[PDB]
Amino acid sequence: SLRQQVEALQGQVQHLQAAFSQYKKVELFPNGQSVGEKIFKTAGFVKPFTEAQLLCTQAGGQLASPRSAAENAALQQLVVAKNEAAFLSMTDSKTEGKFTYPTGESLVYSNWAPGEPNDDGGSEDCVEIFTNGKWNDRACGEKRLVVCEF
Amino acid sequence: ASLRQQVEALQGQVQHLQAAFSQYKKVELFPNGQSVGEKIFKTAGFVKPFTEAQLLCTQAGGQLASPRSAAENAALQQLVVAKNEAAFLSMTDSKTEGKFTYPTGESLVYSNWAPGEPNDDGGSEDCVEIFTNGKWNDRACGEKRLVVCEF
Amino acid sequence: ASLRQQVEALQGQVQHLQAAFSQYKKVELFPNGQSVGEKIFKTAGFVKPFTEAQLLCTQAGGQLASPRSAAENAALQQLVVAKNEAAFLSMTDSKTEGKFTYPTGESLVYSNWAPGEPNDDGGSEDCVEIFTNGKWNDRACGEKRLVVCEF
Ligand SMILES: O=P([O-])([O-])O[C@@H]1[C@H](O)[C@H](O)[C@@H](O)[C@H](O)[C@H]1O
Ligand SMILES: O=P([O-])([O-])O[C@@H]1[C@H](O)[C@H](O)[C@@H](O)[C@H](O)[C@H]1O
Ligand SMILES: [Ca+2]
Ligand SMILES: [Ca+2]
Ligand SMILES: [Ca+2]
Ligand SMILES: [Ca+2]
Ligand SMILES: [Ca+2]
Ligand SMILES: [Ca+2]
Ligand SMILES: [Ca+2]
Ligand SMILES: [Ca+2]
Ligand SMILES: [Ca+2]
Numbered sequence: 001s002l003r004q005q006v007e008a009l010q011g012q013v014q015h016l017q018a019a020f021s022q023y024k025k026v027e028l029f030p031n032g033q034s035v036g037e038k039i040f041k042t043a044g045f046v047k048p049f050t051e052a053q054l055l056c057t058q059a060g061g062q063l064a065s066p067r068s069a070a071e072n073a074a075l076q077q078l079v080v081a082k083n084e085a086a087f088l089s090m091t092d093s094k095t096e097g098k099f100t101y102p103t104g105e106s107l108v109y110s111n112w113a114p115g116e117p118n119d120d121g122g123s124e125d126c127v128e129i130f131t132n133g134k135w136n137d138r139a140c141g142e143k144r145l146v147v148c149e150f
Numbered sequence: 151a152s153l154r155q156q157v158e159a160l161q162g163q164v165q166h167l168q169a170a171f172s173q174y175k176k177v178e179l180f181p182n183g184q185s186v187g188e189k190i191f192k193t194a195g196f197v198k199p200f201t202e203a204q205l206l207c208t209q210a211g212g213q214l215a216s217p218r219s220a221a222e223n224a225a226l227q228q229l230v231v232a233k234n235e236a237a238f239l240s241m242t243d244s245k246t247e248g249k250f251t252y253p254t255g256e257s258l259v260y261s262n263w264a265p266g267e268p269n270d271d272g273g274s275e276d277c278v279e280i281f282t283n284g285k286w287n288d289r290a291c292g293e294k295r296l297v298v299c300e301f
Numbered sequence: 302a303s304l305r306q307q308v309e310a311l312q313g314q315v316q317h318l319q320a321a322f323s324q325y326k327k328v329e330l331f332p333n334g335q336s337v338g339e340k341i342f343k344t345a346g347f348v349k350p351f352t353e354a355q356l357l358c359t360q361a362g363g364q365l366a367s368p369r370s371a372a373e374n375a376a377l378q379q380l381v382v383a384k385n386e387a388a389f390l391s392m393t394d395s396k397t398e399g400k401f402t403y404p405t406g407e408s409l410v411y412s413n414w415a416p417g418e419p420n421d422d423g424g425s426e427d428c429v430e431i432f433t434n435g436k437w438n439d440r441a442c443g444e445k446r447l448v449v450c451e452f
Contacts, residue, residue: 005308016315016319022452023174026330026341027177029450029452055180055232058228154304157304157308157311175321194332
C-alpha cells in the first residue's frame with residue numbers, strides 16, 4: 001500500500017529526471033549556454049544598453065556578467081555563434097574609471113582588450129564583449145547583442 | 151524502514167528538480183514568453199493571417215491568445231509592445247455577426263475594445279487584433295498579425 | 302503513518318511538477334520544435350554546411366535529424382515546411398559510396414528518397430537533405446541547409 005505508492009512515485013520521478021534532462025538540451029539549443037550554476041541566453045537581436053538591461057531585469061535575470069574565465073568563455077560561444085558583440089552588465093556611469101556590477105560591487109574578474117577601458121571621446125561607460133572574448137568600453141547608446149544571465 | 155530511506159532519497163530528487171526547473175522557466179520565457187497566473191503566452195515572432203495563426207497554435211497543443219482578465223491582457227500587451235506588432239486574438243464573430251466567441255463558442259468574459267469598436271468596418275471584420283496600447287479592434291481575418299499562442 | 306503523510310505530500314508535489322513541466326514543454330516546442338514519440342526535433346532556424354551543422358548538434362548533446370519512420374519524417378517535415386528551407390539529415394555515404402549510414406555506422410532502417418534518388422550527382426553527393434514535401438535527395442555536404450537537431 002505504501003511500498004507500492006513509493007514504487008509508483010519512484011517511477012514518476014525517474015521519468016521526470018529523464019524528461020527534464022532532454023528538455024534542458026532542447027531549451028539551450030541554439031541560444032543558451034550553461035556554465036556552473038549560471039545560464040546565459042541570447043535574445044538574438046541588438047538593443048542599446050538601457051533597453052537591453054530592462055529586458056533582462058523584466059525577465060527575472062540580468063545582463064551577462066561573466067565573473068571568471070570559464071563564464072567568459074561560455075558567453076563568448078554565444079557571441080561567436082551570433083557574430084555580434086554583446087553588452088555586459090557593468091558600467092562606470094556612477095564613478096568614471098570605476099566599473100561596477102548592477103549591485104555597485106567592484107569587478108571580481110575582467111578581460112579587457114589591450115588599451116581598454118579608454119573612455120573614448122569621454123563617453124564610454126558601458127562594456128561590450130567581442131567574438132575573441134575580450135572586453136571594450138563602449139557608448140551605452142550603441143546597439144549590441146542582448147544576452148541575459150539566469 | 152527501507153521505505154523511509156527511499157522517501158528521503160526521493161525528497162532530495164524532487165527538491166533538485168524543483169530548483170533546476172525554476173531556473174529553466176525563466177530561461178525559457180526569455181524573450182518571447184510571458185507568464186500570467188497559470189497561463190503562458192508565447193509569440194512565434196512573425197505575422198500570419200488568422201486561419202494560419204489559429205492552426206499553428208492548435209497544432210502546437212494550445213490556442214490563439216485569449217486574454218480573460220485585465221491582468222492577462224496586460225501581460226499579452228507586453229509581448230506585442232516588445233515585438234512592436236499588433237497580434238490576433240482567438241475570438242471571432244464569424245458565426246453570428248456582433249457576437250464574439252472563443253474557439254469553444256463561449257461568449258466573452260472580458261474585452262478591451264477601443265472606443266467605437268467593434269465596428270465591422272466595410273461589413274467584413276470578424277477577427278480581433280490587440281494593439282501595442284493593449285486595446286482591441288475587430289479586423290479582417292485575412293490581414294497578417296503577430297502569432298501569439300497561449301498554453 | 303507520518304511516512305504516509307510524507308509520501309502523499311511528495312506525490313502532490315511531483316504531480317504539480319509533472320503538470321508544470323508538461324506545460325513548459327509545449328511552450329518550448331512552439332514554433333521551432335516537434336515531438337514525436339520520445340524524440341524531439343528542434344531547428345536553429347538558419348542554414349549551415351553539413352560539417353558545421355553536425356558540430357552544432359553534437360555540441361548541443363544531440364545529433365542531426367535522423368528520421369527512422371514515416372511518423373518521424375512527417376514531424377521533421379513540419380519544421381522544414383515552417384521554415385521553407387530544406388534541411389540536412391545526419392546520414393552520409395562518405396565511408397562506402399551508395400551505402401547511407403547513421404553516425405554510428407548502422408545501415409538505414411527507413412528511407413524516403415525522391416524518385417531517382419540517391420543519384421550521387423556530379424559523382425559527389427554524400428549528404429542527405431529533406432525537402433518541404435518530406436522526400437529526400439542526396440546533396441553535396443558543402444552546400445548550406447537548414448540546421449535541425451534531434452534530442
Ligand atoms: O569609434 P571608432 O574609432 O570606430 O572605434 C573605437 C576604437 O576601436 C577604440 O580602440 C575603442 O576603444 C573604442 O571603444 C571604439 O569606439
Ligand atoms: O483600414 P484602415 O481604414 O486604415 O483602418 C480602419 C480604421 O482604423 C477603423 O477605425 C477600424 O475600426 C478598422 O478596423 C480599420 O481597418
Ligand atoms: Ca562617464
Ligand atoms: Ca567611462
Ligand atoms: Ca573603448
Ligand atoms: Ca461577419
Ligand atoms: Ca464582424
Ligand atoms: Ca474595427
Ligand atoms: Ca562519395
Ligand atoms: Ca554519395
Ligand atoms: Ca541527388
